[PDB]
Design a protein around this ligand. Structure first.
Ligand SMILES: OC[C@H]1O[C@H](O[C@H]2[C@H](O)[C@@H](O)[C@H](OCCCC3CCCCC3)O[C@@H]2CO)[C@H](O)[C@@H](O)[C@@H]1O
Ligand SMILES: OC[C@H]1O[C@H](O[C@H]2[C@H](O)[C@@H](O)[C@H](OCCCC3CCCCC3)O[C@@H]2CO)[C@H](O)[C@@H](O)[C@@H]1O
Ligand code: NI
Ligand code: NI
Ligand code: NI
Ligand code: NI
Lengths: 126, 131, 126, 131
């Protein structure tokens, strides 16, 4: 086997070590090795996708802007689930379909802007 | 068992007649009774004092009054009544929304109307599901 | 104008009269006349539709049966919203699309059976 | 600031290497650091003691173990954690489900795993949104 040495900051190490004692790992090396294993494990043209994001609806009238943006590409949209989590925040999940290339750009149009948080895209190609 | 006499204008009776025949009704009393039972049934479904769920669906033009924002702002105004909302972008202009609500059937009802009323919003429909 | 006389049962009349005094209608005739007005007021090949229904998921494994039924016609299905209202009951709203004729039959396949309650179909033709 | 030495097997290092280059990483430490930050970030997101919402998505074959029924039965088993579920019939065989959850992030997390684990269920993914 081989060895790779990396420099890690204190807080990150405090969090890694926290999970180390608990999770029952001998040390940092073993924990990191497992995390890498899963990360790498978790890695077509047509398919589906799930886009989730959080945003304040009033902010910049963002709600209106996101809906029109989606309507500009409604052909790629199957449907959206919306949950009014609090007085100002909205949680939306858009199920998208079509060309993975166009879906990915459509995703950038929606979440790559101010007022949108926790944006995540999950692709599911056929 | 009571015979109730109803006074109807010509235009209205012709409508009741035409619509009735297309739908297979051969006489007016049966037709009127079905409408009445249906309608009274829904009203009783929308009464204060009882908890439950409801389904509110409607079609709206998102560009309108920035109707998109107002419909959401209003939902947030009463977010204690909202479970979740499914939205389908019909075409470039229209949005199909289905809001699932919970709480007091009467309050839900009053809320639905405030929504279905707004201009730009068409095909509105409420279905209360009392506990 | 004209007059039509109808026979109505006691309970129904008790409910109509209840709404009469409250709603501020002079009498049965005026209330019925308004109800008819709305009913009649509220009345294409391609379009959308909203199907809602309630059912006990465990009952006859109904949940499994409804999903396959929908999958048999998945081409007509856009998406379904599901809310687990209690321990045994489920509330589902299926947004359907396609030929109104096929949508209507597809609706019968889903809600016209035992264990399904409050089934309602709303058509929205283009 | 601490230098941490990690011991990796040949196969694993080759994978890290290949995947890294395709994704534009020119060296191993940066790649490993990004993975670590990302991963630790999610874990901290799934901790008991904090309330919030979550999005759980997965694809499953409805015919399977009558998986359809078990997935729903299980959801009902913890329906206090469930807000609502969007379901999309991908094709004749597969179902895309997106369940929105609320409650204690740790409990939600444990629930998600119980679901993502089941056989027949693929592409599972959890995203916790702590209050
Ligand atoms: O719970 C029983 C039924 O309740 C609702 O049906 C409604 C129906 O959607 C409505 O259209 C009809 O109205 C009948 C009015 C008939 C008029 C008379 C002549 C002119 C035009 C129609 O009432 C029934 C209720 O019984 C549901 O849509 C249906 O799926 C369910 O099985
Ligand atoms: O909150 C910041 C970001 O958080 C998530 O991004 C993730 C991304 O989805 C994941 O793929 C990446 O992993 C990087 C791991 C890179 C590996 C190194 C070499 C081998 C293959 C990948 O981390 C970022 C977080 O910073 C969201 O998906 C993204 O929309 C958001 O803007
Ligand atoms: Ni909202
Ligand atoms: Ni829309
Ligand atoms: Ni359910
Ligand atoms: Ni399905």
């Amino acid at each position: 086997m081989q060895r790779v040495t990396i420099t890690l900051d204190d807080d990150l190490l405090e969090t890694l070590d926290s999970l180390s004692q608990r999770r029952g790992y001998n040390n940092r090396s073993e924990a990191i090795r497992d995390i890498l294993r899963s990360a790498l494990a978790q890695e077509g043209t047509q398919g589906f996708a799930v886009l989730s994001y959080v945003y304040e609806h009033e902010k910049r009238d963002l709600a209106s802007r996101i809906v029109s943006t989606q309507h500009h590409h409604h052909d790629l949209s199957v449907a959206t689930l919306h949950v009014h989590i609090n007085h100002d925040d909205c949680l939306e999940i858009a199920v998208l379909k079509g060309d993975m290339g166009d879906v990915q750009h459509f995703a950038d149009d929606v979440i790559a802007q101010r007022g949108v948080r926790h944006g995540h895209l999950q692709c599911l190609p056929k």
